[PDB]
Amino acid sequence: STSPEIASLSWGQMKVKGSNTTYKDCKVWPGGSRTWDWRETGTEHSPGVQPADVKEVVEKGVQTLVIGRGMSEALKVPSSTVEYLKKHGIDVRVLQTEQAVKEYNALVAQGVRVGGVFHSTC
C-alpha cells in the first residue's frame, strides 16, 4: 500500500487523503492513518513522544518516520525514542509540524514508504 498525502494542516486540525476523519493529532503510515491521542499512552509535552506512540507506525513497515513535534516545538522527543526507531533501521525526521507535513508529503511524492506522528498545536 501507499503512504497517504496529508491534505490539510491548520491549528489543531489535520486531514489525511482518503480518511473520513478530521484529526487533531494523527498517525499516518502506508495504507492508512489514525487519530493520535496522548491519553492512550499517557504522553505529555515532557518527557514527550514515547516508543509506544510510534510503535504502531513501526509495525506497518516504513523506511522513514517523520515526527511533527508541534507548532512551536514545545513537545519534547527523548533520544531513547529516536534510538528505538534507529535500531529498527528507520530514517527519522524530527521537525516543527508545518515543516514535518511538508517533508512527509515530499517523501510521499517520491514514493517512499513513509510514516509519521504529528502534533498540530503546541
Swiss-Prot record:
Family matches, as CDD domains: Mth938
Keywords attached to this entry: Cytoplasm
Positions of the UniProt region annotated as MTH138-like domain: 6-122
Subcellular location, principal: cytoplasm
Subcellular location: Cytoplasm
Biological processes annotated in GO: negative regulation of apoptotic process; positive regulation of fat cell differentiation; positive regulation of transcription by RNA polymerase II; transcription by RNA polymerase II
GO cellular component: cytoplasm
InterPro entries the UniProt entry points to: AAMDC, MTH938-like_sf, NDUFAF3/AAMDC
Keyword Cytoplasm on entry: yes
Pfam families: DUF498 (PF04430)
Record family assignment: Belongs to the AAMDC family.
Cited function: May play a role in preadipocyte differentiation and adipogenesis.
Protein name, entry field: Mth938 domain-containing protein
Organism: Homo sapiens (Human)
